[PDB]
From a paper:
All structures have an RBM2 ring positioned just beneath the RBM3 ring, with this ring termed RBM2inner. As in previous reports, we observe more than one stoichiometry for the RBM2inner ring; here, we observe 21- and 22-mers. The resolutions of these RBM2inner densities are 4.1 Å and 3.7 Å, respectively. The density begins at Gln-125 and ends at Gly-227. Although our model for RBM2inner appeared similar to the previous structure at a global level, the RMS deviation was 1.2 Å for Cα atoms, which is higher than anticipated at this resolution. The main positional differences were found in a long loop (residues Leu-180 to Gln-190) between secondary structural elements and at the termini. However, the overlay had a high RMS deviation throughout. One possibility is this high RMS deviation reflects the ability of RBM2 to adjust to different MS-ring diameters and symmetries. We also observed additional densities on the periphery of RBM2inner ring. We observe 11 regions of density, which we tentatively assign as an RBM2outer-RBM1 complex.
Residue numbers in the entry:
A (entry chain H), B (entry chain G), C (entry chain F), D (entry chain E), E (entry chain D), F (entry chain C), ...: 125 to 160, 171 to 227
Amino acid sequence: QFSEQVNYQRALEGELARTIETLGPVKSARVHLAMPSPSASVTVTLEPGRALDEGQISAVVHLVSSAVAGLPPGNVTLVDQSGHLLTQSNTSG
Amino acid sequence: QFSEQVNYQRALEGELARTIETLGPVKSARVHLAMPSPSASVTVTLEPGRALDEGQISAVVHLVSSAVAGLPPGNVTLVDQSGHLLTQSNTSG
Amino acid sequence: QFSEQVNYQRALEGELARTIETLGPVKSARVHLAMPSPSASVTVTLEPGRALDEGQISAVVHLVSSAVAGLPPGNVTLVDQSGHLLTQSNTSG
Amino acid sequence: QFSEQVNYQRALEGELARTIETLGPVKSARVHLAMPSPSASVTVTLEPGRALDEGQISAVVHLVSSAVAGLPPGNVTLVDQSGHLLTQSNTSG
Amino acid sequence: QFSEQVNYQRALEGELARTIETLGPVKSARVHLAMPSPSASVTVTLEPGRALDEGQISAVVHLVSSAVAGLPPGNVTLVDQSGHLLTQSNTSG
Amino acid sequence: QFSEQVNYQRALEGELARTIETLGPVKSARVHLAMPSPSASVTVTLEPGRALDEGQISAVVHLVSSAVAGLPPGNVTLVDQSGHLLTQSNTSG
Amino acid sequence: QFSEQVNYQRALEGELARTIETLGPVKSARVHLAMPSPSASVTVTLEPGRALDEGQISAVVHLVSSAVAGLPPGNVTLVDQSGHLLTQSNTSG
Amino acid sequence: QFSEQVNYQRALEGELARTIETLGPVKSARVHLAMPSPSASVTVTLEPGRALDEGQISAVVHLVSSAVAGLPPGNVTLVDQSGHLLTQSNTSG
Amino acid sequence: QFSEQVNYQRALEGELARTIETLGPVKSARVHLAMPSPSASVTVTLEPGRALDEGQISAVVHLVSSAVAGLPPGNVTLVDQSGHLLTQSNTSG
Amino acid sequence: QFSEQVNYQRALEGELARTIETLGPVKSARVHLAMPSPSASVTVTLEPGRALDEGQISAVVHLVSSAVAGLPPGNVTLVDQSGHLLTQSNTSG
Amino acid sequence: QFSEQVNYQRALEGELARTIETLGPVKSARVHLAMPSPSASVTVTLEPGRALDEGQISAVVHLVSSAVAGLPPGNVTLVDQSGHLLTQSNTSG
Amino acid sequence: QFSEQVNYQRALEGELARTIETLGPVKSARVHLAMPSPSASVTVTLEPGRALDEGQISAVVHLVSSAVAGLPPGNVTLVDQSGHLLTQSNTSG
Amino acid sequence: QFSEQVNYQRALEGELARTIETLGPVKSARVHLAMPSPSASVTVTLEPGRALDEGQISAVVHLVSSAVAGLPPGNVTLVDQSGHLLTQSNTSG
Amino acid sequence: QFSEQVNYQRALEGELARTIETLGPVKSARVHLAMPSPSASVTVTLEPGRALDEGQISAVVHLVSSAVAGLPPGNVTLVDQSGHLLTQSNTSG
Amino acid sequence: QFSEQVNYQRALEGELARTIETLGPVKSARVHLAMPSPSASVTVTLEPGRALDEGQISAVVHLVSSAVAGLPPGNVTLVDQSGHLLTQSNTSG
Amino acid sequence: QFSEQVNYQRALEGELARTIETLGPVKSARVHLAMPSPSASVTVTLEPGRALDEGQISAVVHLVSSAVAGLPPGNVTLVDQSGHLLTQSNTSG
Amino acid sequence: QFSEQVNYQRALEGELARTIETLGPVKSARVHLAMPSPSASVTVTLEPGRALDEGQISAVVHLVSSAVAGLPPGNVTLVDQSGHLLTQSNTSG
Amino acid sequence: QFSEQVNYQRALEGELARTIETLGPVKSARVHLAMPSPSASVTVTLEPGRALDEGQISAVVHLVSSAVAGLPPGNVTLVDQSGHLLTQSNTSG
Amino acid sequence: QFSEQVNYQRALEGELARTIETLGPVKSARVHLAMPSPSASVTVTLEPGRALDEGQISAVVHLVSSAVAGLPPGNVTLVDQSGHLLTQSNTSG
Amino acid sequence: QFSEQVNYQRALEGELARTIETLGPVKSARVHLAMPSPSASVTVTLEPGRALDEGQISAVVHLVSSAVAGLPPGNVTLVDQSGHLLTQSNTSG
Amino acid sequence: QFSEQVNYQRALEGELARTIETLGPVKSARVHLAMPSPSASVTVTLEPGRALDEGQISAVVHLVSSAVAGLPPGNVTLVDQSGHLLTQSNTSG
Amino acid sequence: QFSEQVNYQRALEGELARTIETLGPVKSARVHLAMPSPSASVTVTLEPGRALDEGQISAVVHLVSSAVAGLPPGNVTLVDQSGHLLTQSNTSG
C-alpha cells in the first residue's frame, strides 16, 4: 500500500513538473509535495530575459495549490533559479 | 481498488483534455483534478490571434465544473499559456 | 463491480453521443455525466449555417435530462463549438 | 445480476425501437429508458411529407408509456428529427 | 431465475402475437407486457379495407386483458397502424 | 419447478385445444390460461355455415370453465374468428 | 413428486376414457379432471341414431363422479358432440 | 412409496376384475376404486339373454363392497353395458 | 416392508384358496381379504349336482373366519357361482 | 424379522400337519394359525369307513390347542372333508 | 438370537422324542413344546399288544413335565395313536 | 454366550450319563436338566435280573441331585425302562 | 472367561480323580463339583475284597471337602460301585 | 490374569510336592490348595516300615501350613496312603 | 508385574537356598516364603554325624528371618530331614 | 516495513540533494533528515566567487523546510563548506 | 523401574561382598539386604586360625551398617561359618 | 529486527563520517552514536596547518547534533587528533 | 534419571577412591556412600610399617566428609585392613 | 538473541579499540564493557616518549564514556601500560 | 540438564586443579566440590623441601574459596600429601 | 542456553587473561569468575626482577573489577606466583 502511495505521489510530481514546464519561458522545474495545514515547495528555473506578471506568478501559485487537495494558496514557497524569494507572504519580515 | 480509482481518474483527465482540445482555437490543455469543497486547475493554451467571449470563458469554467460531481463553478482556476489569471473571483484582491 | 459501473457509464455516454449526433445539423458532440442534485455537461458542435429553435434547444436539454434518472431540466450546461453559453438559467448574472 | 439487468434493458430498448419503427412513416427512432416518478426520452425521426394526428402522437406517448411499468403518460418527452418540442405539458412555459 | 422469467414472458408475447395474428384481417401485431394496477400496450396493424365492430374491438381488448392475470379491461391501450387512438377511456380528455 | 409448472400448463393448453377442436364445426381454436378470481380467454374459429345453440355455447363455456380448478362459469371470454363478443355477461354495458 | 402426480392423473384420465368408450354407442370421449368442492368435464361423442335413458345418462354422471374421490354427482358437466347441455342442474336458468 | 401404492391399487383392480369376470354370464367388467365415506364404481357388461336375481346383484354389490376396507354396501354404483342404473338407493329420486 | 406385507397377504390368499378348493365338490374359489371390525369376501364356485349342509356352509364361514385374526363369523359374505346370496345375516332385509 | 416370524409359523404349520397326519385314518389335513383370545382352524380329511371317539376328537382339539401358546381348547374349529361342523360349542345355536 | 432359540427348541424336541422312543414298546412319538402357566402336547404311538401301568403313564407325564422348566405335571395332554384321551384331569367333564 | 451355555449343559449331560452308566447293572441312561426350585428327569434302563437297594436308589437320586447346584433331593423323577414310578414322594397320591 | 472357568473346573476334576485313584484299593472314581452352601458328589468304585476304616472313609470325605473352598465336610455324598449310601448324615431318615 | 494365577498355584503345588517328597521315607505325595479361614489337603504316601514322630507329623503340618499365607496349623487334613485320619483336631468326634 | 514379582521371589529363594547350603554340614535345603505377621518354612537336611549349637540354630533362624523384611524371629518353622520339630516356641504345647 | 521507510527516506534525501545541486553556484550538497519539533542539517558547498542574497539563503532554508512535513523554518542548520554558521537564529548567543 | 531397583540392590550386594572379602582372613562372605527399622544379615566365613578383635567385629558391623542408609548398628545379625551367633544384643536371652 | 536497526545505525555512521570528511581540511573522522538525554562522540582528525572558526566548530557540533533526532547541541563531545578537549561546556571545571 | 544418579554416585566413588589412594602409604581403599543425617563407610588398607598422625587421620575423616554435601565430620566410620575401629566417637562405649 | 547481543558488543569493542588506536601515540589498546550505574575498563598502552594533556586524558575518558549509553564520565578506569592509575576520582584515597 | 551440570562441575574441577598446579612447588593436587553453607576439600601434594608462608596458605584457601560462588574462606579443608591438617579453624579442638 | 552462558563466561575469561598478560612484566595469569555480592580470584605470575606500584596493583584490581558488572573493588583476591597475599583488605587479621 505504501509503495502504491509513493508511486502515486511520484507520478503526480512528474505530471506537475511537466505541466509547469509547459508554461512557455521555463525549460524545467522541480516540485516536491509535503503531506502532514500542508505546504509545498516550488523551485522554478525562469528562462533568462523573461518575466511574467504578478497575476501570473499567482497563476503558478494557484496552479500548484489547486490541483492538490487542501493546499492553501498562501503556503506555496516560490523560488527562482538564483535566490529571489518571491513569496513575501510566507516570509513576512 | 486504489489502482482502479487512479486509473479512472486518469481516464477522466484524458477525456476532459480531449474534449477541451475539441473547442476550436486550442491545440492542447492540461487539467488536474483535486478531490478532498473540492477544486480543480485548468491551464489552457489559447491559440494566438484568438479570444473567446467572457460568456464562453464561463463556458469553459462550467464545462469543467459540471462534468465532475460537487465542483462549484467558482472553484476553477483558469490560467492561459502565459500568466493571465482570468478568474478574478478566486483572487479577489 | 466498479469496472461494471464505469463500463455501463461509458456505454451510456457513447449511446447518448450517437443519438445527439443523430439530430441533423450535428456531426458530433461530447457528453459527460456527473453523479453525486446531479448535473451534466453538453458541448455541442453545431453545423455552420444552421440554427435550431429555442423550443428545440430545450429539446436537446430535455433529451439529455430525461434519459438519465434524477437529472433536472435546469442543470444541463449547454455550450456550442465556440463559446455561446446558451443556458442563461444556470448563469443568471 | 447487473449484467442481466442491463442486457434486459437493452433488449427492451431494441424491441421498442423496432415496434416504433413499425409505425408507417418512420424509418428509425431512438428510445432511452430512465429508471429511478420515472421518465423516458423519445427522439422520433418523422418521415418528410407525413404528419400524424394529435390523437396518434398521444398514441406514441401511450405506446411508450404503457409497455413499461410505472411510466406516467405525462412524463414522455417527444422530439422530432429537428427540434419540435411537441410535449407542451412537460415544458409548460 | 430471472432468465426463466424473461423467457416465459417472451414466449407469452410470441404466443399472444400469433393468436392475435390469427384474427382474420391482421397480418401481424406487436404486444408488450408491463408488470409492476398493471397495463399493456397493443399496436395492431389492421388490414386495409377492413374494419371490425366495436364489440369485436372490445373482443381484442378482453382477449389481451383476460389471458394475463390481473389486467383490467380498461388498461389496454389500442393503437392501429397509423395513429387512431381508439381507447377513449384511457385518454378521457 | 417453474419449468415443470409451465410445461404442465402448456400440456393442459394443448389438450384443451385438441378437445375443443374435437367439437364438430371447428378446425382449431386458441386457449390461454390466466392464474392469479381467475379468468380465461377463448378465441374460437367457428366453421362457416355453422352455428350452435346458446345451450351449447354455454357448453363451451362450462367445458373450459370446469376442467380447470376455480374458474367461475362467468369469467370465460368467448370471441369468434371475427369479432362477435358473445359473452354479454362480462361486457354488461 | 409433481411428475408422479401428473402421470397418475393422466393414467386415470386414459383409463376413464377407455371405460367410457366401453359403453356401447360411443367411439371415444374426452374427460378432464379438476382438483382444487371439485368438478369435472365430460365431452361425450354419442353415436348417431342412438340415445340412452336418463337413468343411464345419470349412469354416466355417477360412473365418472364415483371412481374419483370427493366428486359430487351434481358437479359433472355433460356435453354431447354438438352442444346439447344435458346437465340442467348446473345451468339452472 | 406412491408408486408402490398405485401398483397395489392397480393389482387389486386387476384381481377384482378377474374375479367378477369369474361369475358366469360376464365376459369382462371394469372396476375403479375411489379412496378419500369412500365409494366405488362398477360397470358390468352383462351377457345377453342372462339376468341374475336381485339377491345376486346384491351379491355383486357386497362382493365388491366387502373385499375392500371401509366400503359401505350402499355406496357402490352399478351400471350395466347400456344404461340401467340399477342402484336406486344412491339415486333416490 | 409394505412389499413384505402384501406378499404375505397374497400367500395367505393362495393357501386359503387351495384349502377351500380341498373341500370335495369345489374345483376353485376366490378369496379376498379386507383389513381396516374387518370383513372378507368369498365367491365359491359350487360343483353342479352337489349341495352341502347349512352346518357345513357355516363350516366354510368359520373356516375362513377363524384362520385370520379378528374376523367375526358374521362378517363373511358368501356367494355361489351364480347369485345365491346365502348369508342372510349380513343382508337382513 | 418378519420373514423369520413367517418362516417359523410356516414350519410350525408343516410340523403340525405332519403330526396330525400321523394319526392313523388320516391321509392329510390343513391347519392354519391365527395370532391376534386367539383361535385356529382345522380342516380334517377323515378316511372313509373310519370314525374316532368323541374323547379322541377332543384329542385332536387338545392336540392342536396345546402345542401352541395361549390357544383355549374351546376356540378350535373342527370341520371334516364334507361339512360336519363337529364343534357345537363355538356354534351354540 | 431367535434362530438360536428355535434351533435349541428343535434340538430339545428331537432329544425328548428319542428318549421317549427309548421306552420299550414305542417305535416313535411326537412332542411339541408351548412356551408363553405353560403346557405341552404328547402324541404317543403305543405298540400293539402292550399296555403300561398308570404309575408308568404318570411316568411319561412326569418325564416330559420335569425335563422342561416350569411345566406343571397336570398340563401335559397325552393321546395314543388312535384317540384315547388318557389325561382325564385336563378334560374333567 | 447362549451357545457356550448350551454346550456346557450338553457336556454336563454327557458326563452325567457316562457316570450313571458306570454303576454296574446299567448299560445306558438318559438324563435331562431343567433350569428355571429346579428339577430333573432320570430315565434309568435297569439291567434285567438286577435290583439295587432303596439306599442305593437314593444313591442315584443324590448322585444326580448333588453334582448340580440347587437341585433338592426330592425333585428328581426316577423312572425305569418300563413304567415303575419309583419316586413316591413327588407322586404322593 | 467362562471357557477358562470351565477348563479350570475340568482340570480340578481330573486332578482330584487321579489323586483319589491314588489311594490303594481303587482303580478309578468319578467326582463332580457343584458351585452355587455348596455340595459335591463322589461315586467311588471300591476294589473287591477291600474295605477301609470309617476313619479313612472320613479321610475320603475330608480329602474331597478340603481341597475345594467352602465345601463343608457334611455335604459330600459318598456312594460305592453298587448302592451303599454310606453318608448317613445327609440321609438322616 | 487368571491363567497367571492358576499357573502360579500349580507351580507352588509342584514345588511343595517335591519338597515333601524330599523328606526321607516318602516316594511321592499329593497336595491341593484351597483359597477362599482357608484350608488344605495332604495325602501322604508313607513308605512301608517307616513311622515318624508326632513332633515330625506336626512338622509336616507346619511345613505345609507355613509356606502359604494365612493357613492356620489346625486346618491341614493329613491322610496316609490307606485311611489313617491322623488329624484328630479337625475330626473331634 | 506379577511375573516380575514371582521371578524376584524365586531368585530370592534360590539365593537363600545357596547361602544356607553354604553353612558347612548341609548339602542342600528347601526354603519357601509366605507373604500376607508373615512367616516362613525351612526344611534343613542336616548332614549325618553333625550337630550345631542352639546359638547357631538360632543363627539359622535369624539368618532367614533377617534378610527378608518384616519376618519376626519367632515365626520361622525349622524341621530337619526326618521330623525333629526344633522350634518349640511355635509349637508351645 | 522499516526497510521501505528507510528506502523512502534515502530516496527523498537523494532527490533533495539533486534539487539543491540544481541551484546554480553549487556543485553538490549533503542533506540529512531527522525525524522524532523535528529538525534537519544542511551542509552546502558554495561555489567560490559566488554569494547569494539573504533572501535566497532563506530561499534554501524554506526550500528544505517546506518539502518535508512539519519542519519549521527556524530549525534548519545551514553550514557552508568551511565553517560559516549562517543560521544565527538557532545559535542565538 | 522395579528391574532397575533390583539390579541396583544386587550390584550393591556384590560390591559389599567384595569389600568384606577384602578384609584379610576372609575368602568370601554372603550379605543380604532387607528393606521395609530395617535390618540385614551377614554370614561371614572366617578363615581358620584367625580371630579379629571385638573392636573389629564391631568394625564389620558398622562397615555394613554405615554404607546403607537407615541401618542401625544394632540390627546387623552376624554369624560365622559354623554357628557362633556373635551378636548378643539382638539375641538378648 | 535488531540486525536491521544495527545496520541502519552503521549506515548512518558511515554517511555521517563521509559528510564530515567532506568539510575541507579533514581527511577522515570517527563518529559513534549513543542511544538510551542522548549523547554522541566525535573524534575529528584536523588537517595540520588548518584551524576553523568557533562559529564553524559549532557548525560541526550542530551538524552532528541536528541530523539525529533528540540530540541536544550541548551533548556532543569534540576531540581533535591529539587531546584538545574543545567542548568546555561538558567539562565545566 | 535413576541410572544417571547411580552412575554419578559410582563416578564419585571411583574418584574418591583414587584420591584417597593418592595419599602415600595406601595402595587402595574402598569407599561407599549412604544417602538418606547421612553417613559413610571407609575401609582403609594401611601400608605396613606406616602410621599417620591423629591430625592426619582426621585429615582422612574431613577429606571424605567435606567433598560430599551434608556429611558431618563425626559420621565417618574408619576401619583399617584388620579391625582397628579408630573412630571412638561413633562407638562411644 | 543472546548471540546477537554478544556479537554486537564484540563489534562495538572492536570499533572502539580501532578508534582509540586512531589517536596518534597509541599502537593498540584494550577496552572491555560492563553492563548491569554501569562502568568500563580502559587499558591504554601509551607510546614511549609521549604524554598528552590532562584535557586530552579527559578526552579519552569522555570519548569512551560518550559513545556508550548511560556511562557516567566518572566511572571509567584508566590504566597505562605499566601501572599509572590516572583516575584519582575513582580511587579517592 | 544433569549431564550438563556434572560436565560443568568436572570442567571447573579440572581448571582449578591446573591452576593450583600452576603454583610453583606443586606437581599436582586434587580438588573436589561439594554443593548443598557449602564446603570444599583440597588435598595438596607439596613438593619436598618447599614450604610457603601462612599468608600464602591463606592464598590457596582464598584462591579456592573465591573462584566458586558462596564458599566461605573458613570452610576449606586443607591437607598435605601426608597428614598435616593445617586448617585449625575447622578442627578447633 | 546454559552452554551459551558457559561459553560466554569462558570467552570472557580468555579475553581477560590475554589483556592482563598484555601488561608488561607478566607472561601469563589465571582468572576465574564467580557469579552468585560477587567475587573473583586472580593468580598473577609476576615476572622476576619486576615490581609495580601499589597504585598499579590497584590498577590490576580495578582492571578486573571494572570490566565485569557488579564486582566491588574490595572483593578481588590477588595472589602472586608464590604466596604473597597482597590484598590485606579481604584478610584483615
